[PDB]
Design a protein around this ligand. Sequence first.
Ligand SMILES: [Ca+2]
Ligand SMILES: [Ca+2]
Ligand SMILES: [Ca+2]
Ligand SMILES: [Ca+2]
Ligand SMILES: [Ca+2]
Ligand SMILES: [Ca+2]
Ligand SMILES: [Ca+2]
Ligand SMILES: [Ca+2]
Ligand SMILES: [Ca+2]
Ligand SMILES: [Ca+2]
Lengths: 333, 333
Amino acid sequence: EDCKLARDGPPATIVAIDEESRNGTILVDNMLIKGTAGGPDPTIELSLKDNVDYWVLMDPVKQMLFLNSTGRVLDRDPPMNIHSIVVQVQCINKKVGTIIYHEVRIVVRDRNDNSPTFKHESYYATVNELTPVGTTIFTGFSGDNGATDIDDGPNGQIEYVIQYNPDDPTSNDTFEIPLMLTGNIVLRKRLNYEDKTRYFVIIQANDRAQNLNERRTTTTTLTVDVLDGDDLGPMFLPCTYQAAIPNPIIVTPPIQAIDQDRNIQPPSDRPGILYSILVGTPEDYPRFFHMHPRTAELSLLNRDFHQKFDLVIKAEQDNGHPLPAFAGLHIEI
Amino acid sequence: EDCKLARDGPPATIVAIDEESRNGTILVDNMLIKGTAGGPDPTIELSLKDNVDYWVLMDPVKQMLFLNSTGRVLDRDPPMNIHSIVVQVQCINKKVGTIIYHEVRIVVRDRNDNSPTFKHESYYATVNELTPVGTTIFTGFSGDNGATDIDDGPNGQIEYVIQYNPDDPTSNDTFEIPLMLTGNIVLRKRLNYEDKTRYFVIIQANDRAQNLNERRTTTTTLTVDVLDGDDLGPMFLPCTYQAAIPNPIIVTPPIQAIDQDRNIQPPSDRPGILYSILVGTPEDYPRFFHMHPRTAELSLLNRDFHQKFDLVIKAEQDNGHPLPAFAGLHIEI
Ligand SMILES: [Ca+2]
Ligand SMILES: [Ca+2]
Ligand SMILES: [Ca+2]
Ligand SMILES: [Ca+2]
Ligand SMILES: [Ca+2]
Ligand SMILES: [Ca+2]
Ligand SMILES: [Ca+2]
Ligand SMILES: [Ca+2]
Ligand SMILES: [Ca+2]
Ligand SMILES: [Ca+2]
């Protein structure tokens, strides 16, 4: 009869304990095994079996199991991955000679003992100033190239969240993370490179433990650089061109324009200027004037018929963004 | 012989004088008419003819003509439009009886005695914050609904030019007039309504007289109001929804979103919010949950099969600008 379970219920003893419990922690009150080990005339014999690196010790009389973790650590996490522990409690019957193995399964439960950690020390993005609000401009926290958390379940999920930068109070306002779980940054305000070209964006990763009081965090700075877009065309220099006649025709000062965006990258994209005449009076002006369209050099083609010509000059960009600039030119005879 | 011209040259005397000359101004030195009026025995008789409101007086002996403008003004401009003056100098010959008319044409020359003037005391425009740089946003100086100048030729043309506002040093920088002659204003920087909603733009009109020292000007304030565009979608309130089960299902707090742009005009354009569930676990969640797409009301459709459902909720705009917002919802059993 003895050496079989005294309790009702199923024939494994299943129990659970928080990971990171310390030496001596009870694991089973009372196995509750019909019979009595020890005393003067013991009726059963108990011992442990498949107890590797003796994580369990036993008190055969009270039939009670303790953890045995001195010096070592009961870590459910990488790199230990101790999720359960199974051991067997071989009982021998001293009369009848019966030998049973009582299984004891011990379920270690993750705790939120680990914080998020970012793979990189800092992160970094760029964004052309023409980007519309709504645009995702950064996705570097995917690929597990962002924060990680060694813990399991929600103890191991990240929500990313922008934080106020006291050394850049504008950063806060100019970007967001609509989806906390992705941690994609999204442009929230329009930009003028001309005004401000860099943003320091603190992002705070945080795990998602149920008890909000058990929730670890990290932060990182994301440096974001604004890129000069082509939103402006040329401008003449020096910042009404004058000519005279009774060749090529000398023009004071000399017609020169330049793109107004002053830091296009790469230079490969820096466009060129095309000069034309646009309108003029007397209206027969085309009879007498061409202008070379990449250098603005006066082709000439009658004092008492025409005292003077007054023209107006276009310069525009040569990349299907004319964004054109204008300047007069007077010409006496 | 006498009473014919003594000078060579053509048979009209043409001469010119600046408008706004004052009484006594000589108009002809010497008509230079063969013969001699007055003295003891005059040989010719001179008088004026077609001299209306006697703008000319004559000295028959010296054969000299003076202006006669006392009390009145020699105004080439509207509303006087005195461009020339023609009079005839009837000479009679006292022997032979010859009668000639010497024409005298007097060409009044515009002066820059009049400044530009704006039709309105102030001007005004609006502009949605989504307008791209390059966009013409104002054209109210066409139609001669801008500045005018009563003077003629260049004395009468306008160039419009933005000026620095010390009470709005940003206005300067945010708009330009690429074409001075039109005076169209063009957006020069991107805008965030959220930051600044009004601009006071001083524009200076100026005439285009040749002598730059003779050039009159005017100024005007243009008030420009920024309009809130739809660049942002909704946001949930109060600024992770919780539910429980062993209908409709009660949600704490109750799911409510709202558009983030907070001054769309007209209200006609204020959009509506559409709620859906997006993703969920356990993944069989669709078996049990619909949500009404305009009110977010939980349709329900097993304690030991499913302990809990954890869903995530979209709210998006209903005008083909989803610009969607996200929020979790947990549900215990
Ligand atoms: Ca651990
Ligand atoms: Ca852990
Ligand atoms: Ca954790
Ligand atoms: Ca630019
Ligand atoms: Ca450009
Ligand atoms: Ca006048
Ligand atoms: Ca005048
Ligand atoms: Ca004028
Ligand atoms: Ca807006
Ligand atoms: Ca909106």
